[PDB]
Write an enzyme that holds these catalytic residues in place. Structure first.
Site, PDB file in Angstrom:
ATOM      1  N   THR C  15       0.743  -1.265   0.000  1.00  0.00           N
ATOM      2  CA  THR C  15       0.000   0.000   0.000  1.00  0.00           C
ATOM      3  C   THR C  15       0.780   1.328   0.000  1.00  0.00           C
ATOM      4  OG1 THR C  15      -2.214  -0.625   0.700  1.00  0.00           O
ATOM      5  CG2 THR C  15      -1.343   1.432   1.600  1.00  0.00           C
ATOM      6  N   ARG C  16       1.810   1.422   0.831  1.00  0.00           N
ATOM      7  CA  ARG C  16       2.629   2.626   0.938  1.00  0.00           C
ATOM      8  C   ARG C  16       3.553   2.937  -0.268  1.00  0.00           C
ATOM      9  NH1 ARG C  16       1.573   3.818   6.290  1.00  0.00           N
ATOM     10  NH2 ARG C  16      -0.571   4.579   5.973  1.00  0.00           N
TER      11      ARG C  16
END
Ligand SMILES: CC(=O)N[C@H]1[C@@H](OP(=O)(O)OP(=O)(O)OC[C@H]2O[C@@H](n3ccc(=O)[nH]c3=O)[C@H](O)[C@@H]2O)O[C@H](CO)[C@@H](O)[C@@H]1O
Ligand SMILES: CC(=O)N[C@H]1[C@@H](OP(=O)(O)OP(=O)(O)OC[C@H]2O[C@@H](n3ccc(=O)[nH]c3=O)[C@H](O)[C@@H]2O)O[C@H](CO)[C@@H](O)[C@@H]1O
Ligand SMILES: CC(=O)N[C@H]1[C@@H](OP(=O)(O)OP(=O)(O)OC[C@H]2O[C@@H](n3ccc(=O)[nH]c3=O)[C@H](O)[C@@H]2O)O[C@H](CO)[C@@H](O)[C@@H]1O
EC number: 2.7.7.23
Lengths: 326, 326, 326
Positions: C15-16
């Site tokens: 996600t990041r």
């Protein structure tokens, strides 16, 4: 959020820069140091920005002509308090007066906002940092954990010199209170100058409270006096920006060899190789690939464009899916 | 300032360089390591420079042909003392003999001059540094605070090995005294070699005094044996020079991406962007702006000239106010 | 050297990274992170490589199409143990099963081989590192110096949290033993997931021995979750490679401004100036000089060739003694 104005002290000489350009006009990422401070003041919500200058008012006024600054001449450089006294007549009793230096370019609006929030009523919000070696800086004096004053290094004793918490010089207080304390400033001390720092003991004596806040990063309160120190901040600045970009989703092949000197708007999955310099307002669409060593200046590069190594893109808007280079 | 000559020991192999070029000839900023030492010796005032070499005398003699060196062949590499013994016949009894290594390129004339000043009469001026880990280096022995000798790591006991102050190898003494001690050097020790370091105990025994001085920076006494260590000094060197320039008034957009490989003469308010390389003799007039990645070599650039990014300026004298580039 | 296979867990979200490209496909030196792990597995001698993935199987399968991988889908991300359970049916009882992460690109074959060598029979070879701050990582529990289990940070007490030795996640065990312990994995803990780490207490309980080994460098077990952390490894990687090259005899004018993104074959006395990038398979003959800022890609440069600054050499085989550039 009580109304507030800002005073920037930029009247010191700047001798160790060996330049015919006023020190606070030298750039940090393509922006004069003082403009950084001015931008920070404005984003913080300053209703007025008082710039206190010594000479070069002409170079300074010409350079900063696009800013709504209230010019305050400090005839002779007789200390920060004296410089503040010249600006005082302009503070409104109904506003907070935040004071900043024109040669401490990286002060952040986040830290200044926390300072505003910590300023008690009728009191002073002070920005302090604990250094390993506090030599040369104003020492913060406390009594039962409370700030009571600031003693300048030269005025401190050997015992007080052991104090590690020092004054970064940035502070905020009500303008009416400020006018009042400024009027009481004396000039007999180790340096025969009006110390703005004396306003701390003066506020404590009136029974008012001084609250110290600390900056997020020490570089944020670093003042520049020579080019070596400016170059160190340019790096801290560049590096801080490279990391934000990496964290925000832009791939920098080497954040240590990236220079943003202006404003970058970017899409998703952008790739920027080493030694790339971004100047002025630049927009990078989605999946744009910038080859090593490109200089992109005031341009807009459409989505999926690929720019070959060492290309200078200037004053251009490049149509999407372009292939700029062999 | 008694007359003085210098002996440079550059006779060791250089195996870990994996090169067909004699180690001391590899460049540090476009200048062979040994030339750095030779330049330092000459600026210090050396009347004669004795270069002690093993083989490659031809490559070495060809490369260093423009120097007035007295070539001293060290047939076999039997230790620093042995290398010194070959040079001895050439020391004048009326001069000081300073000894340096041909593979310690950053020794400064300032530190050597302080060494000369600390050399007592009839005594030895020794350059020592306290390391965290002194392993592999000659240990300095003292008695009531006075230098009494040097014990080589391999010859030291576990107790002596705890000594942190070590020998950098650089030293100065009177030539007559030097000849005398050199003649007494023995070769039976942990390594069967003539240790120049034994001259310390020998001078102490004759009742003479040995005074240790320390270098300003540790990199100043770093010897190079492989390219990795050479690259580390190139960086220390480049970085030290970038800072001098910043402090002297030249703006380097990034002192970490600047390379001076020769001699730079500059005016006021010069700006040099990142990845710029300066080679040979270069002159930059007032307010010259050098774009990122330029290579300027043996050129003279007139005042107010602006050189666009990635321009190679070579063998040129550029008229003032020139605009080199799109 | 008992036969052995490898399982790479590359099923986590990513996600990041804020990318439409599966995290483990982002490149470290022109090679997807997971390819690094896969290459390491193969050079180590892995008979089979099981890649455990969540979604993007298509992007992943397309990208890694030239590898003989056994694709193992982990439907939902229910912990490392769960991901391992999906791969279990494929482990052979006659081989060791080494487990790696697809987002820890710098694990070295040397360290993995030492892990294999330390794995007792019927036991588990575990890779652990003592950190200053072990927060967030599995704590290694010992009893009379022997590894007894691993307790996840969230599952640890305040006392256990003081343990500094943590789990790097890499481990090796016999496949039969692995199948057996995997079958016994439970999902009720601080995070309701199947912890592969529970297999340690399970092996200790069966009376089997767990031997911890440590990595040569901490960066070797660094996992990447965002681009900032990837850029940090790119630098550690580039820097590690630059030093090897310097030590092997290639002169890098600045190992900090050198990028190898592929495979370099070189001769003797090669010189590479700053900001040079090597991509794909590159061969540099003897005494080749590469000017600053060149990009050499899938080329062969003959002995004695000199390439001028900023030249891009691509898809070319250059005849010996060439002079590419003004
Ligand atoms: C008396 C006082 O304030 N002391 C503080 C001040 O000292 P100090 O007076 O030593 O600091 P500086 O001389 O650098 O001046 C600070 C700022 O004030 C400006 N300036 C200075 C004198 C003047 O007459 N006019 C003027 O405008 C400078 O241009 C600079 O922007 O800053 C330090 C941080 O750097 C603090 O730790 C000290 O406690
Ligand atoms: C006995 C002696 O002197 N010991 C010192 C010497 O040790 P050490 O002998 O170990 O040092 P090196 O072998 O590196 O030699 C030092 C210098 O002398 C030269 N060389 C060496 C041997 C030879 O036969 N001919 C020759 O010319 C080398 O080329 C180099 O320039 O340097 C160290 C610093 O690096 C000191 O801490 C040691 O106390
Ligand atoms: C229970 C467990 O194993 N704990 C360890 C694991 O924790 P932890 O579970 O916190 O680590 P991560 O979530 O980062 O996952 C590690 C690796 O496993 C993969 N993955 C994770 C969950 C899943 O369902 N499928 C999957 O494939 C990730 O893609 C990554 O490659 O790694 C840490 C090192 O970083 C160790 O210190 C912890 O002791």
């Amino acid at each position: 959020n009580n109304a507030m104005s800002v005073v920037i002290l930029a009247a010191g000489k700047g001798t160790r820069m060996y330049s015919d350009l006023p020190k606070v006009l030298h750039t940090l990422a393509g922006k004069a140091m003082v403009q950084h401070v001015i931008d920070a003041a404005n984003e913080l919500g300053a209703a007025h920005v008082h710039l206190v200058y010594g000479h070069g008012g002409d170079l300074l006024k010409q350079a900063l002509k696009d800013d709504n600054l209230n010019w305050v001449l400090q005839a002779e450089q007789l200390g920060t308090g004296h410089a503040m006294q010249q600006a005082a007549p302009f503070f409104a009793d109904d506003e907070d007066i935040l004071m900043l230096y024109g040669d401490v370019p990286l002060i952040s609006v986040e830290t200044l906002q926390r300072l505003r929030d910590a300023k008690p009523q009728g009191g002073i919000g002070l920005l302090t940092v604990k250094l390993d070696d506090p030599t040369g800086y104003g020492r913060i004096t406390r009594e039962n954990g409370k700030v009571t004053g600031i003693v300048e290094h030269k005025d401190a004793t050997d015992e007080q010199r052991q104090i590690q918490e020092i004054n970064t010089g940035i502070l905020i207080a009500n303008g009416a209170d400020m006018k009042r304390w400024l009027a009481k400033l004396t000039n007999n001390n180790a340096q025969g100058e009006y110390y703005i720092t004396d306003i701390i003991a003066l506020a404590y004596q009136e029974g008012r409270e001084i609250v110290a806040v600390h900056p997020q990063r020490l570089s944020e309160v670093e003042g520049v006096n020579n080019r070596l120190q400016l170059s160190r901040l340019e790096r801290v600045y560049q590096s801080e920006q490279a990391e934000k970009l990496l964290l925000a989703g832009v791939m920098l092949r080497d954040p240590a060899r990236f220079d943003l000197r202006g404003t970058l708007t970017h899409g998703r999955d952008v790739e920027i190789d080493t030694n790339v310099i971004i100047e002025g307002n630049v927009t990078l669409g989605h999946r744009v690939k910038i080859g090593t060593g490109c200089v992109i200046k005031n341009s807009v590069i459409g989505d999926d464009c690929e720019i070959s190594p060492y290309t200078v893109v200037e004053d251009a808007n490049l149509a999407a899916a372009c292939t700029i280079g062999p």
